[PDB]
Amino acid sequence: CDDIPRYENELFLRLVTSTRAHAKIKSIDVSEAQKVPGFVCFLSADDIPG
Amino acid sequence: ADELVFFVNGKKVVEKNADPETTLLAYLRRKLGLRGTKLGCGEGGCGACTVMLSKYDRLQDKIIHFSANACLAPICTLHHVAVTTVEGIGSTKTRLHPVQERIAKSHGSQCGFCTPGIVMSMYTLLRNQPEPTVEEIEDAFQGNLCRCTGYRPILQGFRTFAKSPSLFNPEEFMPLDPTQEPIFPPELLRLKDVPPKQLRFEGERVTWIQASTLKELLDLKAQHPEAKLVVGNTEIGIEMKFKNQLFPMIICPAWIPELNAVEHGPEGISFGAACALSSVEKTLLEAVAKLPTQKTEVFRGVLEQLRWFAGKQVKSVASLGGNIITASPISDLNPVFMASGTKLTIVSRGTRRTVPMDHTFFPSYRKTLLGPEEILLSIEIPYSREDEFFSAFKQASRREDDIAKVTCGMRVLFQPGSMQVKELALCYGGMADRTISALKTTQKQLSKFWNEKLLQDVCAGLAEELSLSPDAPGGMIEFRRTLTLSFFFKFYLTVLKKLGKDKLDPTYTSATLLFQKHPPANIQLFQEVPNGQSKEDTVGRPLPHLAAAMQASGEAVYCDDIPRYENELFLRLVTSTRAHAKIKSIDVSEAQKVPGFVCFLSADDIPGSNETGLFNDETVFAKDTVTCVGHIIGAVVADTPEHAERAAHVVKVTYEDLPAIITIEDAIKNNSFYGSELKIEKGDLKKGFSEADNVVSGELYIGGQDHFYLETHCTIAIPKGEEGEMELFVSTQNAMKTQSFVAKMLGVPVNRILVRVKRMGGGFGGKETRSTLVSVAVALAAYKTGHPVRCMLDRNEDMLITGGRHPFLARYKVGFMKTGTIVALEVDHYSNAGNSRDLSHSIMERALFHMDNCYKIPNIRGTGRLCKTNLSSNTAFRGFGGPQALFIAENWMSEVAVTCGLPAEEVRWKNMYKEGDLTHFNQRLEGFSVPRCWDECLKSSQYYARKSEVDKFNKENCWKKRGLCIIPTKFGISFTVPFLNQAGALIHVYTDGSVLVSHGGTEMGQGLHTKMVQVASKALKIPISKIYISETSTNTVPNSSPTAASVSTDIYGQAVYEACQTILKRLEPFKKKNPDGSWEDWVMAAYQDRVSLSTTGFYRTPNLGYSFETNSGNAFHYFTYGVACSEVEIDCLTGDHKNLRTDIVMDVGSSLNPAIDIGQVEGAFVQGLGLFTLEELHYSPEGSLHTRGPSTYKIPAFGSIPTEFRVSLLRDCPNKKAIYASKAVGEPPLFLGASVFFAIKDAIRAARAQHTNNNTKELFRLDSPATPEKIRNACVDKFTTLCVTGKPWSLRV
Amino acid sequence: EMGQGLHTKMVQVASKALKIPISKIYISETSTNTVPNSSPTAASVSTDIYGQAVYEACQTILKRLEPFKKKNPDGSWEDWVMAAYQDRVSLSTTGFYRT
Ligand SMILES: Cc1cc2nc3c(=O)[nH]c(=O)nc-3n(C[C@H](O)[C@H](O)[C@H](O)COP(=O)(O)OP(=O)(O)OC[C@H]3O[C@@H](n4cnc5c(N)ncnc54)[C@H](O)[C@@H]3O)c2cc1C
Ligand SMILES: Nc1nc2c(c(=O)[nH]1)N[C@H]1C(S)=C(S)[C@@H](COP(=O)(O)O)O[C@H]1N2
Ligand SMILES: N#Cc1cc(-c2n[nH]c(C3=CC(=O)NC(=O)C3)n2)cc(=O)[nH]1
Ligand SMILES: N#Cc1cc(-c2n[nH]c(C3=CC(=O)NC(=O)C3)n2)cc(=O)[nH]1
């Protein structure tokens, strides 16, 4: 799979995962993430169209 | 300076390193990933790259919006400009804009490749005039071309913006709402405030300075006199791309206020030299409405030329000074500027002069009297004076967006209130290498009076003074000379009229009329579906092409639109510049030095076989010898397409010529044929000829045709790196041959090669085989590099290399009775096949099969020979030999009517086959519907009433004539080699109950997939929404015949039907167990029960197999029929004509989709009209093509179609021989375009009775295409007489 | 294929069923548009079940090619395949198995 050449416009995804075994998600803060050079977006449940 | 800032669809683009050579089109497709905007030609002719531009004009103090060709727009002109592309206005993921909605729903998109550019031209009009007039609408598209639709639906759909069941419903159209339009970028409006300043861009090869002030400009021209000015780039863009000019320094003066000012002075109106021609046009139109007629004579000449100058895209960026200083011999403006003494204000640093343009201003080819330091600042177009009159005329190959043959400006100034010539200026383009004045002719007339003797003297003087030698560039010697006289005659008559106030001499009055549009009327008639039919059964309903909305939105993916891999490379073909030569050596040493160069590939690089072609006739890369101009020798592969192009251009081939054989004639004389003669003989010719009252024999020629699919040939090849595996994305009608020619070249099993075809932007037969020329080269580059490689041809390469329709030369003899009844016939056909066999033999056979058209001829012999020549190999082109043969048949039929002195329709009718007769190849005509088509078309076209109206018009008009002709056609349906009539399909039903269909056919705009989906949905009894077709691929359906012969709906439809039956058989017990369940419940239960939800389907046409030796057995499964009646009006002084009205009745059985079938009728029709009247390829005598682009090759334009255009599909004619009682439609109607040609012939006969003949039974030869040249030269008269063929001491008798 | 040699076994199986060498057969990949609704490759039954699927498809090819073998007993695989193609016999089929 990863040996397949990337398209010129091909992007990379990194999962964001929980550090707690059982907990409510109070908030999510992406503001330091957006500062990282090359950030395109952060995706979460609300982005799902289906 | 360094930064370039602009906006694209509302979003800011900051380009830090703009290269001056980057066009917008390249930037949009390759840097911004916005692939809706397309490349179709690269020379401003086709409009596929049309976008909108918006800017603040701080001078009108207003946001302005205009359209432009992205392929010619340098991004370096666009600082502080907002670009709107097709993706800027809507999409199927959000909402279509009204323009996109309507063109899709009104069936104005087929292949869809022209659609975004036509969308953008209509959108642009709407942003300027939210409620346009019908004419403002047609005019919006002078620079857009469509090869598929025949234009009618696009216009009829867009007409709903102005002011039988039906193919569309305008009441469902969302109204335009200008408050919902994208807002002009607010950042850009903040910027209008800041004073502009000089910018500098630096690219690989070119430095560009954007001059902010006149002083900056004139300083820069002093410092850099060699620097090239650029405004619209519509000429420099061509010189750069097509003549390998490099201008290492550009100055763009477009922003400078004095170069854009318009002033109304006592003497005339003054425009800065950077004023677009669209501004010039608007200003003059307003002057012409406001001012006394006698002030505006010169202005109206300018306007008359601007009417026929390029199109909206070009006119909106092309500048006035750009036209004057380019000094093309064929400028339409400079003759007018020169005739008028229009004033040029010319400046340099510390210099200013003003001169009247006159004959000295253009000293020689492409030069003007401007010095190295000097710029054209402003132009004063003068007011006309009392006693001063002016005309301008342009004649071309086509009226819309064409390059002038002869073009002129004519001024006379009389002594006050007299007819006594004080001044006369007759100034012409196209008669020499610069714009010239006939000063010798006109000097002789000063003090003379405007009369008959003056007309005669000027004609005689023009004939002497504007001579052309037989060798003149452009040819068309007699036509060009006739036109210089004809135009003068029009001027002479126009001036007579203007001199006498304002009845003077009717019969003559129409020669003086400027071109004028009658309003369009279009009626389509087809059958409603049976009343009880389910709404979910769409078979027989006018469902839009399934991809039409995505074509309109730019979201449909064509091959080059597929994203590049990051390591993907670019191939450029290296082709022969000689017709016939040994290759002595190849030197790549300059190519190696172009940046990004990767490798040059040639014959030695091939690991498998260099032998390719349908008959194993050809090389993949030429070895030892080249046998045509365009013969592929090699290829350069580089990191960008520009590096590849530049590198290939500088690959040096050294040749030693060999004797060439170019023409049919040469080939006959040299015994140069492929194979041996083909023949069908039936009955007894000698006996036939001996019993005929009359016998006519003659010779007929029909020229070839370039496919001009809007998407040229394109392949992407992906090498996998494992077991020789390769995956190709290809624009082709033939994935099977592509797959096997790529495997043969690589020397790998066919199971290693996967070919995928999503869609083509047109194919028309030209992608039936010739697509492998590019496919196999790209495969070689992928194999050799291990990288993805791609290549899309530029238009010029495509036209040169890939082949076209076959030219035919016929020698015939027909014996007939006095009643018109044909008694015997012989025709010998010769086709120009080019340098390989390809489909030529099958093309000849199809010609022989159609030599009868619809006529019963008891004694008949047809022969065919294929001429082997040093020209690119010709191939399939819609009709596949049929139209040539059928044109030959109608030519001699028409000569039969003339010789008999009988009405042409009577002679055709009495000769017509009847129900059950055998053809000349002994096939029975069962369900022969031509008499019903014929009867209905006579009637619905009101033919007989109109005949009498045409005679009347002809009686009353000396210099225009009308013509009217009605012709039948029949077209045999099947591939003539029996093995190709087979089709497979593969159908999957997934467990959500969605169905994916795959079949061997490809989509090229004809709506095959839409039809297959309609079939599957009727067969399965589910809605089409549940069914989907993604693409055509060799690992889903193997061994497919090319999508060709118009049988794809027939044969794939049956294969899809059969897979549906199997699925239905598997589901039946689940249906039984649960009668009240849904399709979804039944599918899930069959899955849970371990019943397969996948099957193949297959079909093989029964009862086929014609033998040329027994002359028996079915050649075809059935025939498609129809009839067309066309009326034209020709202009006998120029060779222009108008197509006034056409009515078509076509038998397509019970249509699967009447929208799609009417689209096919009209598209085919218009493609045939192009073949028979507009389109013409020219080659030098040594075999090198001249016509390589839409500038010179003229296909039907929006303005070319019949103004009244009516199409009916025959009611109540089910075809038991094909799926759901339908008939094949793709090619049958194309020969109906010949009704235009024969109407033209009738109108020529009329003109020659007017001024040539008392001989009503005379037979003059009119070859195809009947272009303005052939029509004009055929209108023999007192002007032709003065400038014919090429005083002697020295005269016998 | 996950390392277990299933494509290899399948090529072995097809070669034996069609009586042609393994060199004339190839398996490129697995995809939902060539075989739909597949169970996961799992429970060690893939050879068993795809083996039968491949075998049934090979039988169907053999039935279709038989009249050409019969007409030309001394011919090559390649001769029989070309003849079927020229005679418009389909050279594509599915295969299926249910334990
Ligand atoms: C599809 C198409 C159809 C066309 N149809 C026609 C037609 O029917 N009739 C016709 O006449 N032409 C036609 N043209 C030609 C072309 O569009 C015109 O000549 C146009 O006016 C050139 O203007 P431009 O601003 O694009 O010139 P550019 O390409 O930008 O410049 C052309 C030349 O003019 C010089 N120049 C420009 N401005 C100045 C200045 N102020 N002072 C000194 N030199 C200057 C440049 O240095 C350059 O040599 C057509 C072109 C295309 C692409
Ligand atoms: N829009 C469009 N219509 C088209 C073509 C095309 O390329 N584009 N090709 C024509 C030719 S040459 C043929 S043989 C048929 C192929 O399609 P069919 O067999 O599905 O009719 O479509 C015809 N109509
Ligand atoms: N449309 C179009 C059009 C196409 C064809 C046709 N296309 N390919 C072939 C082949 C002929 C052959 O002799 N050998 C081959 O491998 C292929 N014939 C026939 C027709 O009647 N109309
Ligand atoms: N190895 C491995 C392995 C796998 C399985 C197994 N895989 N999928 C399921 C499912 C069960 C179900 O109820 N619904 C489903 O959609 C799937 N069972 C069985 C086994 O014996 N060995």
Ligand code: FES
């Ligand atoms: S691509 Fe620009 S006009 Fe054809």
Ligand code: FES
């Ligand atoms: S739809 Fe216009 S070129 Fe095909």
Ligand SMILES: [Ca+2]
């Ligand atoms: Ca072609």
Ligand SMILES: [Ca+2]
């Ligand atoms: Ca050929």
